[PDB]
Amino acid sequence: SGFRKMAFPSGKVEGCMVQVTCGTTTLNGLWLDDVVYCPRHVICTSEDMLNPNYEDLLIRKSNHNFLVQAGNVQLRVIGHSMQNCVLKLKVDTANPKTPKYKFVRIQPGQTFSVLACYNGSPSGVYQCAMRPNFTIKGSFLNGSCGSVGFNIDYDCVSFCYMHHMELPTGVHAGTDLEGNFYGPFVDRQTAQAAGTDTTITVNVLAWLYAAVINGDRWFLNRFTTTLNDFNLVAMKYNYEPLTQDHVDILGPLSAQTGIAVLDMCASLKELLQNGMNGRTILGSALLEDEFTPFDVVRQCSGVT
Amino acid sequence: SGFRKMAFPSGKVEGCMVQVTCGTTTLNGLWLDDVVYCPRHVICTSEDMLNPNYEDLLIRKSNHNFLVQAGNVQLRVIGHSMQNCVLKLKVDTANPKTPKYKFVRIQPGQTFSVLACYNGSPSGVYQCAMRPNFTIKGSFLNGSCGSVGFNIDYDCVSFCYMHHMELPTGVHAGTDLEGNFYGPFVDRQTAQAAGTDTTITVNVLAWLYAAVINGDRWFLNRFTTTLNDFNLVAMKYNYEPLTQDHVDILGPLSAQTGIAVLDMCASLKELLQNGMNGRTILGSALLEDEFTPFDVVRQCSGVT
Ligand SMILES: Cn1c(=O)[nH]c2cncc(NC(=O)[C@@H]3CCOc4ccc(Cl)cc43)c21
Numbered sequence: 001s002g003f004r005k006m007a008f009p010s011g012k013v014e015g016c017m018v019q020v021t022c023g024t025t026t027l028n029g030l031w032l033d034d035v036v037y038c039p040r041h042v043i044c045t046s047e048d049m050l051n052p053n054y055e056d057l058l059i060r061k062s063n064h065n066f067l068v069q070a071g072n073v074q075l076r077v078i079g080h081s082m083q084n085c086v087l088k089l090k091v092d093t094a095n096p097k098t099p100k101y102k103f104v105r106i107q108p109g110q111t112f113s114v115l116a117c118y119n120g121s122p123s124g125v126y127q128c129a130m131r132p133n134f135t136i137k138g139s140f141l142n143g144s145c146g147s148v149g150f151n152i153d154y155d156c157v158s159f160c161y162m163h164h165m166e167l168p169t170g171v172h173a174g175t176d177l178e179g180n181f182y183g184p185f186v187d188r189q190t191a192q193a194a195g196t197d198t199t200i201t202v203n204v205l206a207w208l209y210a211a212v213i214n215g216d217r218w219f220l221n222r223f224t225t226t227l228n229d230f231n232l233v234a235m236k237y238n239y240e241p242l243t244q245d246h247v248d249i250l251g252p253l254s255a256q257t258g259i260a261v262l263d264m265c266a267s268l269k270e271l272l273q274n275g276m277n278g279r280t281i282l283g284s285a286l287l288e289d290e291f292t293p294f295d296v297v298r299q300c301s302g303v304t
Numbered sequence: 305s306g307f308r309k310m311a312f313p314s315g316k317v318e319g320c321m322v323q324v325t326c327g328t329t330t331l332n333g334l335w336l337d338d339v340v341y342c343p344r345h346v347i348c349t350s351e352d353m354l355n356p357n358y359e360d361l362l363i364r365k366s367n368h369n370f371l372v373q374a375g376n377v378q379l380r381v382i383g384h385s386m387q388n389c390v391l392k393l394k395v396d397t398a399n400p401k402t403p404k405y406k407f408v409r410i411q412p413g414q415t416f417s418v419l420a421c422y423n424g425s426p427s428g429v430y431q432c433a434m435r436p437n438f439t440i441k442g443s444f445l446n447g448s449c450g451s452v453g454f455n456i457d458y459d460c461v462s463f464c465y466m467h468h469m470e471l472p473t474g475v476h477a478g479t480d481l482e483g484n485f486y487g488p489f490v491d492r493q494t495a496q497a498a499g500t501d502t503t504i505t506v507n508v509l510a511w512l513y514a515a516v517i518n519g520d521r522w523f524l525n526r527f528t529t530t531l532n533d534f535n536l537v538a539m540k541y542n543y544e545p546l547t548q549d550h551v552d553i554l555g556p557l558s559a560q561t562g563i564a565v566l567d568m569c570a571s572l573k574e575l576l577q578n579g580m581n582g583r584t585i586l587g588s589a590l591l592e593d594e595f596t597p598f599d600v601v602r603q604c605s606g607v608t
């Protein structure tokens with residue numbers, strides 16, 4: 001029992017982190033096989049960030065201008081290419097610690113672990129979610145660019161995020177491992193504002209199921225609702241609309257607890273309208289939305 | 305910017321986890337050098353747990369009754385001894401992945417990362433704190449016993465916790481790596497109730513400093529207080545008394561923000577008396593107390 005914001009064990013990803021320096025900019029890179037992936041803004045000075053022409057800036061860089069260091073040993077760069085907003089630096093040595101891996105582009109609402117790094121060295125691991133406005137709320141200081149987000153399915157690491165930027169509001173933006181930004185963000189030091197950060201309804205419901213599984217049951221009410229009635233309330237509270245696909249996904253948690261998905265929706269509807277009244281659910285005074293239904297099943301079943 | 309509940313990178317500890325089975329009980333063990341540490345209740349059946357005489361039960365066990373498996377390979381047990389509530393199983397092979405390590409006994413209020421394991425395999429990593437009542441609020445299912453808590457100082461892992469038990473209220477109890485339980489708990493399936501779970505005041509203040517560093521400043525007020533006046537309020541709200549030692553520890557965060565420790569105490573005093581009024585601090589609707597002042601400095605500075 002007990003339910004925590006849990007990240008995946010980070011060992012498989014720690015074995016992939018390297019330091020990439022180009023000129024006076026140093027950030028992190030991800031070394032998989034004989035390729036090192038890193039944000040293309042490693043080639044920029046602080047002044048270039050204002051209006052960078054990456055293709056033009058890249059012309060002035062050769063393989064020897066990218067310094068890749070794995071631990072305290074230097075890697076030989078034998079090729080470099082730009083793919084969207086990431087650089088792929090081909091090195092002469094395959095990473096001996098390369099885990100089984102995939103590159104996946106996640107959808108909003110999906111969660112992942114982040115291994116925050118500085119100078120190619122891991123500082124910490126935390127869990128976050130791709131927000132509905134395609135930002136993530138992370139913990140990243142200067143030098144953290146190139147840190148990655150991932151999920152693990154047994155022994156296969158699915159890399160979904162690479163950190164690139166912090167917006168003026170303190171939220172974060174980045175790309176998948178093909179270098180495509182999540183959302184409309186661009187790697188330029190220009191005013192970019194995020195859209196509405198709506199609550200991930202299906203994740204809140206999954207977390208209310210986790211609360212029932214762990215004994216926090218005070219919020220269960222005598223009501224039910226329909227998807228349409230619930231969504232009228234969800235719209236009002238800046239919650240994402242719940243679909244029949246989300247109801248299907250919650251099926252196993254509904255089966256485990258015996259609480260119909262629409263009954264849990266009615267409980268959530270009353271929590272939105274009435275508030276918590278100074279009470280907590282799983283140690284939280286707000287409705288947590290960064291646990292997916294899959295995370296709840298995994299944590300409540302002990303998948304390793 | 306951004307502030308997350310961050311765990312240490314778990315790789316160094318993942319390389320130490322093994323599966324220990326004695327008869328029909330399987331749990332986790334920690335393999336450091338040629339010794340495997342595990343909860344002594346691995347020798348008990350579910351029936352033995354009601355009133356176990358560990359010395360007597362241990363007489364019926366030989367080295368060959370302890371099955372230690374590292375990955376999918378078996379370790380040869382050449383000795384076994386009981387130290388308080390842990391068994392130390394000497395194996396014929398030193399763990400080749402043994403990191404630099406220490407065994408430390410933490411004080412209440414101190415935080416640590418937990419690598420939750422099942423069958424010697426890591427499932428997740430999360431951060432928690434030794435509560436003032438010597439329980440921890442973890443996430444542990446059956447089979448999680450032997451999972452460890454630790455801190456990392458650069459390349460040295462200080463192991464502080466080994467999981468042993470879940471109380472009827474869903475909170476957790478365990479020992480240091482010398483097998484001594486934190487608090488008054490015993491490894492017996494008997495009614496054991498926890499004392500008051502007071503709030504770790506010095507950690508809340510550190511987290512309010514983290515909030516100011518990250519731009520959440522709405523709660524800063526025009527007041528100050530004294531330790532004595534603050535503690536009158538802290539007592540009333542089941543907060544731990546703040547001492548001059550805690551004030552000294554917060555010194556570097558006070559220097560970084562320019563907010564005197566007693567001014568932050570007055571802000572916290574108003575938050576306790578007035579509540580949050582539906583507002584959040586660092587994404588939380590409650591006052592977070594599982595970040596120590598050291599955690600705040602480390603996360604806000606990027607120690608790797
Ligand atoms: C500089 N810095 C911090 O101090 N905390 C950060 C957390 N995450 C990221 C950064 N860095 C940035 O955002 C840089 C600084 C210049 O502006 C831009 C513009 C676009 C892009 Cl892709 C990157 C950057 C951080």
Ligand SMILES: Cn1c(=O)[nH]c2cncc(NC(=O)[C@@H]3CCOc4ccc(Cl)cc43)c21
Nearest residue numbers: 001345353444445446468469470491492493
């Ligand atoms: C069985 N079990 C779960 O299902 N979730 C658990 C989370 N953490 C621990 C356990 N296990 C226990 O607490 C066992 C079960 C029998 O009672 C006792 C009594 C003392 C001691 Cl030291 C251990 C135990 C859990």
